[PDB]
DNA sequence: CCCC
DNA sequence: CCCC
DNA sequence: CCCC
């Protein structure tokens, strides 16, 4: 199988570890043996002008996934939303309310449907590629999530010297390592079968970085970098 | 403690990773230190004529567990169904409806009770051995689940040269290793305390096998073998 | 951040692995990098005269946490109860019933509020330190849980030769190591980022100890010691 | 809600 | 409830 | 539904 998946992840934290804004949206192409991605795109947001209550992330996600899909022609697109694998192009008010998701889950998706359902329908008529809301059960999504963490670290690397101090909240139970020329992100959950990512970047000088648990959010790590 | 447990696990997958049928039903004897099983039985199903909608699996389980229990005389039998550790022989509609399980779970078990409750009551009157539905809380069940994976791999080993290619979906977060004369199964979850299994088999030559994450079901591995 | 957290953990088990009573209540001070604690208190209960139905544990916890907090002046106190991080001092029946907790959870805390809510209000007016019910989401709480496991082993070490045999049920997925002069406790979940503890103690001789899974409670280990 |  |  |  060849799958394109997209996720938004990584957050700027204040000194009380409260999230300020999300950082990276990543679309990945995942192929056998489905442990990583060698082909991917990234779109950075502005964490300092980000609405956490708003759900722009998923609109960026589905767009970025399509952009990658039109180039690599995958079998399917995985969107990070656990709706039981329902096709976005089939998302109308009728089908949303019939899902066994929270009542709030239903509320949010009726508004997204105005743009995303026709968008998925046109793309399906073009390419025949479905865009399914599968969320947590999907490995390409989790791999995309790992890369979202890595690009958040890269974002921190590229932006540490203008802000002189950054706390980056990583996605769930993943760690990062920084080599001379690349960032390595790895899932901390061995049950996932060895999921990982790698992104080439120039690592700036005069910086020190640390990785430690978020004391307020168990199984979430914090990436801290200074000058 | 000496516990007999039984589980059905392992599935033949198509190339879209959709399960076709279940493979192995295994009953195990588990003793201190409760990390493995050295005494076990296996019953193979036909994955290509298997009904996933049906619940024959649990009927195969309770049969095989009893068959093994009559040989090794355990303290108790663990059946793989999370009902809070209630004895099967005590299953009437009143207590089933009083279980904190889904409405679909209740419907299924009310129909299962017709055969399974007298079966458990008769077995208890003979041997004094209870049959409890404990499921996820039981370690012997997980050990049985691991062996279901091991015997599923063995099934693939024995049937690969007639089918020239097989995708076997293993039970949750377990891996297998293939040595010269045996298959070794290990839980990928270190939290379970080092649970494993081991089964002797003649390993066919001229085969290639690979283990990788199921892209559609996170934390589930896929065993693929070809000629 | 400097956080004081408290948890009760560790249980004396009978030979059917059924818990008799809880052992150790521990309050810990946790600072960056939030992986362990170098400052902690322990209060022992009598497992053989313990009410498991009762909720003495949480009253011992909040008391012991305050005692330590009065000495080290932390930023906040973490109590082991998952109520979404709500301040205990604001817990009345009105806000309790508005919590997304079980019907049993509401009943228990409505009764606890009679004593604990004025206690939390009094402590907050004195020191300005909030006592929040964060529970499973807190890392300092988990560290306290690990030390509770360590002190349960210590309790067993100190009481083994008078009891001539002990089964100690540890907290979820943690292991212990016993050195010449200390007990080392480690989380078995790599997702938590390497949480651990250490307690110096005199180790009695002519004892043998073993660590293995509780066969009736998956992901819970058992500590057994004899003479 | 907590405990194994 | 179970299966991947 | 997502985010830490």
Numbering used by the authors:
A (entry chain E), B (entry chain C), C (entry chain A): 1 to 227
Question: Can I see the authors' text?
Answer:
To examine the mechanisms of ssDNA recognition and cleavage by PhoExo I, we cocrystallized PhoExo I with poly-dA, poly-dC and poly-dT. To prevent the degradation of ssDNA during the cocrystallization, we used the D80N mutant of PhoExo I; the corresponding mutation was previously utilized in a cocrystallization study of the B. halodurans RNase HI―DNA/RNA hybrid complex. In this study, we determined the crystal structures of PhoExo I in complexes with poly-dA, poly-dC and poly-dT at 2.05 Å, 2.50 Å and 2.05 Å, respectively. Each crystal contained one PhoExo I trimer and three oligonucleotides in the asymmetric unit. Although the overall structures of the PhoExo I―ssDNA complexes were nearly identical, PhoExo I formed some base-specific interactions with ssDNAs. In addition, the base groups of the poly-dC and poly-dT formed direct hydrogen bonds with Arg55 and Arg104, and they formed water-mediated hydrogen bonds with Phe17 and Asn214. These interactions may support the substrate recognition of PhoExo I; PhoExo I prefers poly-dT because PhoExo I forms the largest number of base-specific interactions with poly-dT compared to poly-dA and poly-dC. The structures of the PhoExo I―ssDNA complexes showed that the deoxyribose groups of the substrate DNA contact the hydrophobic region of the active site pocket. The PhoExo I―ssDNA structures determined in this study are predicted to present the distributive cleavage state of PhoExo I. In this state, PhoExo I recognizes ssDNA only at the active site pocket that accommodates the 3′-OH terminal 4 nt of ssDNA, so the 5′-terminal 3 nt are disordered in the complex structures.
Here, we report the crystal structures of PhoExo I, which shares 76% amino acid sequence identity with PfuExo I. In this study, we determined three substrate-free structures of PhoExo I and four structures of PhoExo I in complexes with ssDNAs. PhoExo I forms a trimer in solution similar to PfuExo I. The 3′-5′ exonuclease assay of PhoExo I showed that PhoExo I cleaved an ssDNA from its 3′-end at every two nucleotides, and the cleavage stopped at the third to fifth nucleotide from the 5′-end. PhoExo I is predicted to utilize a DEDE (RNase HIII)-type catalytic motif for the hydrolysis of ssDNA. PhoExo I is a novel RNase H superfamily protein.
